[PDB]
């Protein structure tokens, strides 16, 4: 047979890849940043509270304006919040009440959302009648939609429960490239500062770095023990962080092709639902199932603070582009702005 | 100037808050149901009692609106999209009566999921006709899949249909006890199971869902007042 020929051909390549990574490991990140002083104590307070949604909140995405944010609740509603004044700008009744992700275009003209309907619904906000209507429905996925992120006003990359990602052409509505290779539900994706690459984490305990222009997988990152629910890019695009169900966060480097640090604790046993870096990349804010968001020192793996304002499962979190505030969504139907 | 822009957000938010209250009236006056079946389990006829990633079926019993959701084009990996239904009134679980052990393993993980610990399950043991004739023929016994059926006897609260063999009565009440053994091992008053022997010809299926959902809403109110 030749299946075992290939099943042993891959293990020799896996040993070659593993032996090449260890050759590059001469001093751990903890030993490099062991001379810098810690960040001290991070005391953040709930500045605003958003009490519009009825059911649990599954996702939120900050606008590029750093003021407007959109949120998705499983009651079948999309609400765009003004974080400064806490006034709801738009209320969008969804076609299917089961939404699991929402995205805000960098140009503020469109918002996207998807879920168990396997369709990405693009919503045009600046219409001819001043209202909001479904501009485009993206069909073709054979599983629920887990995450989506606009590259521009006509291109959007989505992850789905069918173990594949896809870049869409909103003008035509058809897929232009499919990112296969994951052997599990792709949960989260994160775009680099440039839109040439993106990283996705799936339920196969592995993260893969993809090339948007070519459509090929470039690198694969392992080290997590369970499903990866969250993934976020470092501000410079040379690294990324992941959130797993093994109650740990890990920092992988694109150029080192291996992990650099682990963010865990003995008294932490719940899964991570969302991750995000600060503007300087020094703070790694992770959201946990224990209703609390932790603040990690990305260079010294220490815990600097805790955001413990939510009553139900923390489902999403995100830092603004300017880095001023942090919006955290939870299953208790409340969004909280932290600063 | 700038205060009109502030007032514009203040009044547009008030109009949104007005429609959000109306939509809150209909959201609380409806009961969401998740229909979870198996391969050829007979859950399509349950929908018939009156592509797409999820189907819809709206019906009203005694002027009460129900919303049942059928899983469409979703993979067999359920550990992620099952968390979306941690707020439904009840999960309608349909079983066809080792395939039967798979439905027991699926019911177990649903019953013991961290997010579904407060969600009741309505159990519809379907295909009573096929169950009735295979056992009365004795071609392929059920003792091979479940050996503990030999040491089992008909329970005390059995109400067999007039004209039902005493042997098939022992078979259906043993499969029902299999699901009750899992539910009673971890039920701490948060959720309960409501098993019902249903056939492919039963027309009272929606009346059962009405009667069990009434028990669920009653047991929820008794917990908020800490009575029961």
């Amino acid at each position, epitope marked *: 047979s030749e299946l075992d020929q290939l*099943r042993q051909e891959a293990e020799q390549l*896996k040993n070659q890849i593993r032996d090449a990574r260890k050759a590059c490991a001469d001093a751990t990140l903890s030993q490099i940043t062991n001379n810098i002083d810690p960040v001290g104590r991070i005391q953040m307070r709930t500045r605003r509270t958003l009490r519009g949604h009825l059911a649990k909140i599954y996702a939120m995405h900050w606008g590029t304006d750093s003021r407007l944010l959109v949120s998705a609740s499983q009651d079948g509603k999309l609400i765009i919040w003004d974080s400064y004044t806490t006034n709801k700008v738009h209320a969008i009744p969804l076609r299917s009440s089961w939404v699991m992700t929402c995205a805000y275009a960098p140009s503020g003209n469109y918002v996207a959302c998807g879920g168990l309907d396997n369709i990405c619904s693009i919503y045009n906000l600046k219409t001819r009648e001043g209202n909001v209507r479904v501009s485009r429905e993206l069909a073709g996925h054979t599983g629920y939609l887990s995450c989506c992120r606009f590259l521009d006003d006509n291109q959007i990359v989505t992850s789905s429960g069918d*173990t594949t990602c896809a870049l869409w052409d909103i003008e035509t509505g058809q897929q232009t490239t499919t990112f296969t290779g994951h*052997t*599990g539900d792709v949960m989260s994706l994160s775009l680099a500062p440039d839109t040439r690459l993106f990283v996705s984490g799936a*339920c*196969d*305990a*592995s993260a893969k770095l993809w090339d948007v222009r070519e459509g090929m997988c470039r690198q694969t990152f*392992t*080290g997590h*023990e*369970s*499903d990866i629910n969250a993934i976020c890019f470092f501000p410079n695009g040379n690294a990324f962080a992941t959130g797993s*169900d*093994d*109650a740990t966060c890990r920092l992988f480097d694109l150029r080192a092709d291996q992990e650099l640090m682990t963010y865990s604790h003995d008294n932490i*046993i719940c*899964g991570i639902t969302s991750v995000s870096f600060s503007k300087s990349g020094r703070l790694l804010l992770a959201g946990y199932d224990d209703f609390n968001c932790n603040v990690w020192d990305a260079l010294k793996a220490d815990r600097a603070g805790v955001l413990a304002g939510h009553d139900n499962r923390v489902s999403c979190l995100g830092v603004t582009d300017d880095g001023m505030a942090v919006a955290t969504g939870s299953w208790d139907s409340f969004l909280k702005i932290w600063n | 100037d700038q205060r009109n822009e502030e007032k514009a957000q203040r009044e547009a938010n008030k109009k949104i808050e007005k429609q959000l209250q109306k939509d809150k009236q209909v959201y609380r006056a409806t009961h969401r149901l998740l229909l979870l079946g198996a391969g050829e389990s007979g859950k399509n006829t349950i929908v018939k009692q009156m592509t797409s990633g999820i189907f819809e079926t709206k019906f009203q019993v005694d002027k009460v609106n129900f919303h049942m959701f059928d899983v469409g084009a979703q*993979r*067999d*990996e*359920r*550990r992620k999209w*099952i968390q979306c239904f941690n707020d439904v009134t009840a999960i309608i679980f349909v079983v066809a009566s*080792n395939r039967l*052990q*798979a439905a027991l*393993k699926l019911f*177990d*993980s*649903i019953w*013991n*999921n*961290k997010w579904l610990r407060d969600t009741s399950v309505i159990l519809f043991l379907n295909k009573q006709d096929l169950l009735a004739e295979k056992v009365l023929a004795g071609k392929s016994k059920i003792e*091979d*899949y*479940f*050996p*503990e059926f030999a040491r089992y006897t008909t329970p005390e609260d059995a109400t067999p249909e007039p004209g039902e063999d005493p042997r098939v009565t022992r078979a259906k009440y043993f499969i029902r006890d299999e699901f009750l053994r899992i539910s009673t091992a*971890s039920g701490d008053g948060r959720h309960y199971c409501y098993p019902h022997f249903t056939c492919s010809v039963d027309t009272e299926n929606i009346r059962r869902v009405f009667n069990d959902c009434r028990d669920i809403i009653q047991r929820m109110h008794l917990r908020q007042y800490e009575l029961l």
Partner: nanobody
Amino acid sequence: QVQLQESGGGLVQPGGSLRLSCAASGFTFSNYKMNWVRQAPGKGLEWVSDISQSGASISYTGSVKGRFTISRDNAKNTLYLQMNSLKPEDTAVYYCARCPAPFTRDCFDVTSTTYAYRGQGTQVTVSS
């Protein structure tokens, strides 16, 4: 990387006995509930047995109850399945499966056609 490698197995005469092992790597073996699944020729995957984190809660399927005994050693990251009184109907590829999330009571999708935390599987033939 989470890796599960099944050792032992092969053809066996009716009524024989076979011991299957499962070497684990890339995860804390003590935090997960381990499972055994199999796939008969011309049939889908079927759950066989499971064992809790420490080894207290043990469960088997009815067709193999009293004949198969599952065990685990946390200090060596290994899982065992001692098979006794084998029948010709027990001819299947046996896979070492792990529950998705640690410390959880539920165990989803361990018998799905696609599952990441499941090894390649060892062959067990019961024939003359």
